[PDB]
Amino acid sequence: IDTEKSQQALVQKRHYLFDVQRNNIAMALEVTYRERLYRVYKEVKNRLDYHISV
Amino acid sequence: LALKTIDWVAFAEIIPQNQKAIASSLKSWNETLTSRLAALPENPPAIDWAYYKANVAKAGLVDDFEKKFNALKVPVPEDKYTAQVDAEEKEDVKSCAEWVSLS
Amino acid sequence: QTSGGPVDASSEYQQELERELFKLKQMFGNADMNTFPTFKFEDPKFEVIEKP
């Protein structure tokens, strides 16, 4: 009985798998997005400092 | 920012032995991803103009640079990855529901 | 009085200024740093997530 009861709660917990995938999705998305934001911020800063330097 | 908090040994409890490694890799990814999120702030510090307005003697270079920057819109990419995992989750829900009913 | 002299009669130091500015450029970059920057945007890789 209890072993089946154990199997009940276990499968009940199965939903963790999906949300973790979701977590990586939203994470990696903002990563590439913010990485793009700092790529563009760095590159324009580079040209800006280059001219003011020379 | 919508992040679902998670246990982790509970995660380990629900991995079939055929595909542990990838899952573990997945796990690994998560952690480094989290670090990569804490490795940089949300928004870059916007470049001011007055400091360059009064120091860059080049004609219009600072001006048109700042303008094309304001005229720049970074491509904020869309997932196209969440819907499929949602559907897979739905199917898995159906399967575990019938399983638990029969049990 | 240098409005008439773009360098005010230096008559030399170009042979070194060339190298100085060349090195300054080649360490700052190699593109046309006088123009607005262009940007390519890559996108991440992915994989099968469901049970195979």
Side-chain angles (χ1 to χ4, degrees), chain B residues 83-96:
Chain B
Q84 48 176 7
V85 307
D86 296 324
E88 175 265 359
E89 171 269 355
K90 269 181 50 56
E91 174 38 59
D92 179 276
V93 170
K94 305 148 199 148
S95 174
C96 55

Side-chain angles (χ1 to χ4, degrees), chain A residues 21 25 32 35-36 39-40 43-44 46-47 49-51 53-54, chain C residues 21 24 28 32-35 37-43 46 49:
Chain A
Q21 311 144 17
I25 299 321
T32 55
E35 162 191 38
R36 287 168 176 183
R39 152 161 297 204
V40 73
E43 291 198 6
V44 303
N46 176 225
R47 291 174 191 251
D49 65 57
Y50 154 81
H51 291 286
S53 53
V54 307
Chain C
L21 261 183
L24 200 46
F28 275 137
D32 48 349
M33 268 71 72
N34 207 2
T35 71
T38 186
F39 306 94
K40 189 264 305 177
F41 300 91
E42 61 97 6
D43 264 351
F46 273 102
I49 310 184

